[PDB]
Symmetry: D2
Amino acid sequence: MQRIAINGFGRIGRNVLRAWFESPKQFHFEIVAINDIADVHTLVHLFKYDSTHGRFNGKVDITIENEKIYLNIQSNQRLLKVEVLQQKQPELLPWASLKIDVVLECTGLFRSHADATRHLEAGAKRVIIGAAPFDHVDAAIVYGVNHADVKATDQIISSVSCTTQALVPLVKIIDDAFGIETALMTEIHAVTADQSVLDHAHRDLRRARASGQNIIPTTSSALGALKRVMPKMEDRIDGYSIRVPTINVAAIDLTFIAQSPITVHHINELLIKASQTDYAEIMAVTDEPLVSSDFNHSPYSLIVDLTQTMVVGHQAKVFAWYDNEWGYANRLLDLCDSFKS
Amino acid sequence: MQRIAINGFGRIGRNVLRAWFESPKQFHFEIVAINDIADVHTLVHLFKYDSTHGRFNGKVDITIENEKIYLNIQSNQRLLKVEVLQQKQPELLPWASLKIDVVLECTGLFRSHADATRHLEAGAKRVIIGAAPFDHVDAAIVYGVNHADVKATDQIISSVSCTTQALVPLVKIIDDAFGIETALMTEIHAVTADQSVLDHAHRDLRRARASGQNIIPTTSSALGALKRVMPKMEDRIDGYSIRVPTINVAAIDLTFIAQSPITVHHINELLIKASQTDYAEIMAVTDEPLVSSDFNHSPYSLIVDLTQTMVVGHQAKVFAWYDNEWGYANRLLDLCDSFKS
Amino acid sequence: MQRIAINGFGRIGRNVLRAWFESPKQFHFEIVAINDIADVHTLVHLFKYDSTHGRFNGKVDITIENEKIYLNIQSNQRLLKVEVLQQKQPELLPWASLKIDVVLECTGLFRSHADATRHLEAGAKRVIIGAAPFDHVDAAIVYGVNHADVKATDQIISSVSCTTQALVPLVKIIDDAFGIETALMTEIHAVTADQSVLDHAHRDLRRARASGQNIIPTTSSALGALKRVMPKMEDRIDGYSIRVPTINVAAIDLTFIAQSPITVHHINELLIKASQTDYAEIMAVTDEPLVSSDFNHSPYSLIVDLTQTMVVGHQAKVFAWYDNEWGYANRLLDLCDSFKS
Amino acid sequence: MQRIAINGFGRIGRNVLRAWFESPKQFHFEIVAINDIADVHTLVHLFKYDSTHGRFNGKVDITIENEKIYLNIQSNQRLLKVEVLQQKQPELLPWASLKIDVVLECTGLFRSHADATRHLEAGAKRVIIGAAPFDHVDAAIVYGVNHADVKATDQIISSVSCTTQALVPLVKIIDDAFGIETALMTEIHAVTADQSVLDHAHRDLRRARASGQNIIPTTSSALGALKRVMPKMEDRIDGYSIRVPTINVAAIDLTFIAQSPITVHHINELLIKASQTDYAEIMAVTDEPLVSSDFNHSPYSLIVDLTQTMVVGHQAKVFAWYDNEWGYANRLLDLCDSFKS
Ligand SMILES: Nc1ncnc2c1ncn2[C@@H]1O[C@H](COP(=O)(O)O)[C@@H](O)[C@H]1O
Ligand SMILES: Nc1ncnc2c1ncn2[C@@H]1O[C@H](COP(=O)(O)O)[C@@H](O)[C@H]1O
Ligand SMILES: Nc1ncnc2c1ncn2[C@@H]1O[C@H](COP(=O)(O)O)[C@@H](O)[C@H]1O
Ligand SMILES: Nc1ncnc2c1ncn2[C@@H]1O[C@H](COP(=O)(O)O)[C@@H](O)[C@H]1O
C-alpha cells in the first residue's frame, strides 16, 4: 500500500499521525517513518501529551531493532510501526530504501522547490510541503477545490496554510455565485509558536511581544497562497491576521463587494447548499451561538457562523471558524488519500 | 465651581475620578459626591488598586463628619472632598441639597429617558448617561465631533460608548473627504466585566463562556449609537464586536467602499492632517509596529495604525486602537468641561 | 435503583450528570430530576457545550408536556429521562412526588443544616451538600476514607470540597504511617466561578480582582472540613489557596513534620502502595514530567507527582494534582453508589 | 565616575537601563555601552515599548558617528550617551578602550567562572554575573545583606537571582530571631522568557509546555545560590518553583520549623521591624489583601503579605511578593553604586 513519511515531528507532523488513528475512516495508506533532529523520548512525550488536544488515546511502545528505532503505536483498534530517524539534512535521508511514496515536509525549513526536491534526490517519489510556497511549486492544492487538478508528474506539491483552506472555499463559492469585485480578510487567530512568551528580540517587531497579553495585528501568507490557487484574484483581495491570547481555533472575517445583488438570506443559503453538495467533506455551517473552543478538534477546513453574516448594499461580510491545527492536519491526510485513484 | 457627581463607582466611575487627578490640565469643576450600593472600603480599595491601571498615585482617608461619610483624596498637587452615598434609588439621592450641576450615570441600569430623569427629580440640573441611549436622549454626543450642539435646554445627554468615540470620527473624517458608500466594522475588544470567568448561566450564551481562554463574537450598540449621531449613515454601515482574552485596549477594523479615487498614501495623509488640525485633542496616528498593551492608559479616543491601512479598488480597511476605559473616561470629563459657556 | 436530584445545574451539577454517562462503571442509581433558576434551553446549551471539557457526546431531547418539562438524554449507550424545574426555594420543590432518594445540593447556597433541611421538607429522603459544611452535618464524608462511616440514620450529609477530597488521603496515609506532628497546605487552584473578569465589588477583596491576570492567594474551607473528618488532626493542620489564570486542574502542596524517620523514596513508595491497594480507587501516582493540562478530565481525587517530593530532616513536602470539577464530580457519584440498601 | 556596560540587552539588561533613569536618586555612575547580537533597531523598539512595564518615558535617538553606533537617551532630567556593539565573543569586546569598571553580564550564556572572565581579559575592571553561579565565583552577593563584604580581589561577582534576592533576607531575618531547624520553599512565578508559547521541543520537558495555559512545577537555582552566601544553610533548606500564566510579579511560600516559641504576631512584628531598620531599602510589608499586579513595577527586593503568615506548633509559613524583573534590576544598580569611593 502507498507508503507515507513525515519530515519534522512538530505540531503539524504529530497531529497528522494522531489524526491517522483518530480518523473515523481508516486511511488506506500508512505512515512508516518520521524524521526529526530531536531525541525520540522528547517527541513521544509531545505526541503523547498535548496542552491543546490532550492525552493521545492509545499505547506507544518504542523498540530498538538492529540499530533502527521504531514507534509501535496502537489506538482506535489500529496499529502502526514507524521508523524514527535523526537526519538534519534531507538529501541524505533513505527514502529510497524505505520505498517512501510521499514525504510530508512539515519542518517549515525546506519550503523552496530546491530544498523540497532534496527529498526526491533522496529517493522519495512525491513531496508535499505542509505550508505555503516559498518560490516554485508543481501545484498549489486545497483539498475540496482542486485536489483533482493534480497531474501525476507533479512532485513538489504545496497544500498551503490552514488559513488558506478556509479562505479559498469561501471565495471560490461566492465569486462563482455573486461575483467578488474586491475582498478583504481579517483573520482572528489563536497564538502560534512563532510568538514570544515575553517581549523578546524578533524580526516581527509585532510578534516580539508577549503572546498572552497582547492583541497582535500581523500578516498572513494566506493571501499570496490563494493567489497561486486563483491567479485571477491577484489585485482583488487582501487582508491580515490578528493574534489573540487563546491556545487554538481561529476565525475568518471576509468582507467583499458582490457583483450581482445580495441579501443576507441569499449568501447564507448558498453556503449551506455548498456544504451539502460539492464541499460537504470540508465545510459546515452553524447558526448555534458558539465560541472558539467549541470548534476545537474540529476536522473541517472551515465552519460558517451564519448568524454573523451581514449585508449593507453591495458590501457583505462572512464569518468562519476552523481548528487551525486539526483541519489542516486532516487535509494533509485527505489529500494523500486522493492519489491512489 | 460647577459641581459634578458620579452614580456607580464602577470600572468607569473610578477611572473618571482617577483621570480628574491624572489629566495634565486641571478641570474647572469639582467632583463633590459619588454613590454606590457597595461598601465604601470596597470602593476605596478598588479606587486605590486597579489590575489594569496599577496603583492610584496619592492618598485616600475616610472621614465621618456629621453622620456623613467622606473621601479625602490627595494626588498630583490636587485635593478633593467627596461625599460617599449609598442609595440604590436615584430619586432619593440628595442632589437637591448638594446643588449638583451635572450627574454622570455610570451603572448601566438607568439608560431610559425615564430612569435617568430620576436624578433630575432628585434635584440634579443635568444628567449624562455614560452609555448608548436606551430609548431617548435630548442629545447624543461624541466629544470632538458634535459636542458643541448641546443646547441649554438639553437635560438628558449620552456620551455613547468607547467604540462610538472611535468609530464616528473615522467615518466623519473619511466620509467627508472620500465619501463612504457603505462601511463595515469589526471590533476586537478585550474582556468585558459582564462576562463569565467559567461557563455560566446567562442571557447571552456567547458572553456566558470563559472570557480568558475563548474568542466570543457578539454585538456592538455603537452602531445604534452612530445612527443617532450621524442620521445620514443609516443603512450605510453595520458591524459587530469580538471579545478576546486581553484585559484592556481594543481595536476597530473599519472596511468601507469609497465614492472616489483612494490610495493608501492618501487615506493615511488625511487621517494625519485630521489629527494635526481638527481632532488633535482626541486623535493620534502611529507609524510604529505596536500592539494592544502599548496603548494602555492612552487618553486618545482613537490612535490610528497607519501601517494597517489597506486598499483594493474602491474598497479599503483602516485600523485604529483605543483604550476603552481611559479613552472614554477622559472624553467624559472633556465634555463636562465644555458646558462652561 | 435509588433516585437522585440535583439542585443547581452549574459546573458541579452539570459535570455530575455527564460523568454518570462518560463513566465506564455503570451506576445502579439514576438521575431523574434537576432544578435551576435558568430556563431549560440555557441549561441544555451549557450541558452540551463546555469550554473546559468540550462538546457533550450525546443527543439531548427537550420534551415539554402540559406543564412538566423533561430531558431525554442519550449517550454511551445509556438513556435518562430527567425532569427539569425552575424553583428558587427548595422547600416548595416536589421531591415528594418524584420519590427523591437523594438530593445533591450543588448550588452552594444551602449549606446550613436548616437550609438543607428544606429539601427534606420538600419530601427528599436524604440530602448531600456538595461543599464544606456551614454548621451541623450528620456526617462529613470523603469517599475512599470514611464513606462506610455513613450511618443509615444520617440524612443531611456533606461531601466536603474537591480540595478536601485530595488533602485527606495524603494526611491519613502519611500520619497513619510516619505520624504528622504539624502540616501546612498550599493549594494552587485554577480560576473559579466566584472570581471576577475585571476588578468588581465583592466581599472578598482578593477575589474581587481580575481573575485572568492575577496570582490571587486566599482562604480554603478544606481545613475546616478536614477537621470535621479527621477530628484528631485539629490544631495540627492549616493552609491556604492560590487562584491562578488556568481554566482547570489544581495542585496541592503539603509540607509536614514527620514524627519518625522519613526519606523521599519511602514517602513515595508509601503513596505508591496506597494507590495500588487501599486508595487505588481514587488515587494514582506518576513518575512522569507533566503539567496541569494533562490531568484535565481525570477522575482521580489526587494524582501525586512523585518527582516533586522533598525531605529536609523531619520536615518534608509532597505534591499532588487533581481535576477540581471532575475529580469531585466522580467521587459524588461513587458515594451515591456507596449507599446500597 | 565609574563606567558601567551591559552585555546582553534583554529583559534584565533593558530594565536595568530603564531603572537607571526612573530612580529618584541620580546614580553616581553612567552606563556607557551596551552589546547585543541583535540589531540596534529592535533593541530600541523593545526598550521603548514593553508589555510588562508599558512605554519608556523619554526619547532615544540613534546616531552613527565615525563608524560607531550610539544611543542618545533623554529622560527624567538626565541623559546617557550609550554605545551599541555587535560583538558576540566577549574576549573581542573593547571594554579596555571604553575604560569599563563594571560589566553587567546578562546574556545568561556566560555564568561560568572562565567565560565571565573573558570580559576582564577584554580590559574589564570588574564583572557582575546577573545570574546564580554556574561553577564557582569570587563571591555571591545579595544587596542589603552582604554587599559590604566585597573585596577588590573580587572581580567575578554573581548577583544571584530575583528569587534569592527575596529568599535570603527572609531566612536571615528569621533564623537570626527564632532559628531555623529546616525550611522548604515554594515559589509561584510569572512566566519566563525560556518557556514555550505552544507545546514545543525543549531540553526541560515541563518548560516545553504552553506558557499561557499551564501550571508548571519545575526548579529554582535560588537554593543553590543561598547556600553560597549562607553555607550554614546547606542540608537545612530545599524548594521548587511553579510557573503560572501571569506576565510578571512572583511570590514565595517559605515554610520553616522554628527553634523557639513563635506566634503569628511576633513573626509579622519582626519583619515589620526589619523593614524599618536594617533591611529598609530592600524590604516592605503589607497588611492589605493584595494581588500580583498590585506589586508590578515595585523596586523592593521583597514585600511580605502579613495576613498570609501562618503558625502550627513549631511549623510556620510566610509569604512575600516581588517584581522579578524590576527589583532584581534595582539591586544591580544598588550594587554598582556600592563600589564607589
Ligand atoms: N533540519 C531538520 N530536519 C528535520 N526536522 C527538523 C529540522 N529542523 C527542525 N526540525 C523539526 O521541525 C519542527 C519545528 O516545528 P515546530 O516544533 O512545530 O515549531 C520540530 O519537530 C523540529 O524537530
Ligand atoms: N442601584 C445602584 N445605584 C448605583 N450604583 C449601582 C447600583 N447597582 C449597582 N451599582 C454599581 O454600578 C457598577 C456596575 O458594575 P461595574 O460598572 O462593572 O463596576 C458597580 O460599581 C455597582 O456596584
Ligand atoms: N436557587 C437556586 N436553585 C438551584 N440552582 C440554583 C439556584 N441559584 C443558582 N443556581 C445554580 O447554581 C449555579 C452556581 O454554580 P456555578 O455554576 O459553579 O457558579 C448557577 O449556575 C445556577 O445555575
Ligand atoms: N555577546 C552575546 N553573545 C550571545 N548572546 C548575546 C550577546 N549579547 C547579547 N546577547 C543576547 O541578548 C539576549 C537578551 O536576553 P533575553 O532576550 O532575555 O534572552 C540574549 O538572548 C542573548 O543571546
